Amino acid sequence: VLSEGEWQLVLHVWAKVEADVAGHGQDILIRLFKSHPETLEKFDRFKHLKTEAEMKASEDLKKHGVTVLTALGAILKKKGHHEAELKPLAQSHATKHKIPIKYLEFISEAIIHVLHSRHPGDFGADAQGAMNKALELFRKDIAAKYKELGYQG
Numbered sequence: 001v002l003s004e005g006e007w008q009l010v011l012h013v014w015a016k017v018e019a020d021v022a023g024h025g026q027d028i029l030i031r032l033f034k035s036h037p038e039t040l041e042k043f044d045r046f047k048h049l050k051t052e053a054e055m056k057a058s059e060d061l062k063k064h065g066v067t068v069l070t071a072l073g074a075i076l077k078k079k080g081h082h083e084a085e086l087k088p089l090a091q092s093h094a095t096k097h098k099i100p101i102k103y104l105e106f107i108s109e110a111i112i113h114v115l116h117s118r119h120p121g122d123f124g125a126d127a128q129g130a131m132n133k134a135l136e137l138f139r140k141d142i143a144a145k146y147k148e149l150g151y152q153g
């Protein structure tokens, strides 16, 4: 359970992300795909992209980054009371997209790295710890839904 102070750190940096949702979404997906190429293979939509320059040039990738970060921002702003938001997301990611929980750990690392690069003054160690806690809570609650549906592993 995050404290109120932890949530305030999380949402303070998140409000900075929302100044450039699409740039952050590109940076995060590109970091994910470069750091963990197995993740790119899960996207029929993107798996033709073979270089970082091609990834940066893809408008469709930039659009999907906005989709992802909009969904995540709506979850963070619930401060833990996010059951309604996680149901469809766990269902699609477990049963249609076939995304292991471990790949959610990978994208969480990419999000933290990009926030640290773009917002160092609002993403000191206290805020890094709080965002890690928030992303852990996200993964815990998604993993419980995966387990229900027979996909935790």
Ligand code: HEM
Binding pocket: 039, 040, 042, 043, 044, 045, 067, 068, 069, 071, 072, 088, 089, 092, 093, 097, 099, 103, 104, 107
């Ligand atoms: C912060 C974590 C993530 C969030 C908030 C998120 C959110 C979303 C949303 C909102 C959609 C469209 C609606 C839906 O299908 O449910 C989507 C689609 C999808 N996501 Fe995620 N996602 C996350 C992580 C991942 C990861 C780590 C992967 C793969 C390694 C992945 C793979 C996919 C795929 C394959 C689609 C379908 C893309 C298409 O063909 O249109 N997601 N995601």
